[PDB]
């Protein structure tokens, strides 16, 4: 996994795309938060089923892996869901049956933070080829600071080295674009610091799921790995 | 602002590097006050990053109540790069996981992650500048937000100019970008769980004005 070029790295993602899912309603029919429950749960199981083909990822020690998509679950739906929506200014785009607006997400906060990223990656005209790259860097960084033993720090030299190559990748894909050095480092900056208001808005998504008190809002280690599918 | 070099860049952020505190010579109490007190210079520090009083005091508070535990925070990792396994919150209150502890962790995980990074003086100042605009639609805005997004701009420029001075190619030029700048999530990360401690128990965006609206 090491060993992939740059133009192999960003097929392997490419090819492991996750497709977009519908919300499950009746359309003939006149529960919001019910609905977009619904659509994130089913979307989770197609995440992993993506991680799992991320190069370097299934590497790790299964508890490795859980740990990683227990951090970083929502971050990864949320820049999906903003991809999805840059197409559509002013409304989010959850599902093509499910297109809302910030008035319908009345929370609104989030909404609000949402809609903002996707005009930032709108004007940026974000490219496929970067977006998937983003992917992999949340699902390897969200969780490597929040894991002491001797192979755990194996782990994350390991997911370090990963994350590094991803990065070459992003270059890469800038260069090929016809960017200058200069410009490839600062888009390369301004693409990492969206994560970070990613990583905000899945810290306000995760404090409300908390908040709920609730068994099955949060999924749980052996959920995870369950689908994971050892 | 948009004029300056980047070696004129870093020695402003040097020359504007807010002071060590102490603390007095119970713990939470002694915390609250050595952050307030961190607090007033933070404000004359932002004031002194370039891009930062170009903007309207509307923004610059806005700017600050969405940064500033973060800034406290990066600075309490710095502080305790060279201490492995302590917070030295001042050089008289020097703490361990124990006297806390899932905050604690998190900055003692920050801590440790600079340490393998060996993260330079010159670095820090351009991250922690970078917290402070980054962090938080009139046609005014509009202009401030393009205005920031520039500075910015310029940071990473800056940053990757520290690099290539010391010897560093390319490759790890732009590895050691995304590694500096991927740390900015978990410290946004660990703001939000702090903020989360605290409002179970943070200064008000009135009180943010007062200090930031100064006379002449
Ligand atoms: O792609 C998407 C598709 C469908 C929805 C979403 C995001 N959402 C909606 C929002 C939200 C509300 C409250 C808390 C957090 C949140 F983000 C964010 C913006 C509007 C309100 C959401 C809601 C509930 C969620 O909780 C599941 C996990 N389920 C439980 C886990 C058991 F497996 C309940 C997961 C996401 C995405 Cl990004
Ligand atoms: O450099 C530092 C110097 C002194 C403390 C701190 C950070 N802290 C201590 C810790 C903490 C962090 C996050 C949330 C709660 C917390 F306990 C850090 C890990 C364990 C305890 C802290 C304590 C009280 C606080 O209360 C404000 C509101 N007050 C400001 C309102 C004035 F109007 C002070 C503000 C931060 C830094 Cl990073």
């Keep these: 996994a090491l060993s992939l070029t740059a133009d192999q790295m960003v097929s392997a993602l490419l090819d492991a795309e996750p497709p977009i899912l519908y919300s499950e309603y009746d359309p003939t029919r006149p529960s919001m938060m019910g609905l977009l429950t619904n659509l994130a749960d089913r979307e989770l199981v197609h995440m992993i089923n993506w991680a799992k083909r991320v190069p370097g990822f299934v590497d790790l020690t299964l508890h490795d892996q859980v740990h990683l998509l227990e951090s970083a679950w929502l971050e990864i739906l949320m820049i999906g869901l903003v991809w999805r ?18 008035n319908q997400g009345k929370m609104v906060e989030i909404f609000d933070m949402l809609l903002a990223t996707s005009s ?87 404090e409300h799921l908390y908040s709920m008190k609730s068994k099955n809002v949060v999924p749980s280690y052996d959920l995870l790995l369950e689908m994971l599918d050892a």
């Design 85 to 102: 929506s840059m197409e559509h200014p002013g409304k989010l785009l959850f599902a093509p049956n499910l297109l809302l607006d910030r």
């Design 120 to 206: 930032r990656f709108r004007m940026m005209n974000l490219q496929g080829e970067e977006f998937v790259c983003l992917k992999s860097i949340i699902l390897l960084n969200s969780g490597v600071y929040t894991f002491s033993t001797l192979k755990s720090l194996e782990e994350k030299d390991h997911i370090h080295r990963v994350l590094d190559k991803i990065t070459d990748t992003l270059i890469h894909l800038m260069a090929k674009a016809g960017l200058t050095l200069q410009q490839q480092h600062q888009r390369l900056a301004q693409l990492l610091l969206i994560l970070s208001h990613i990583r905000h808005m899945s810290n306000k998504g995760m």
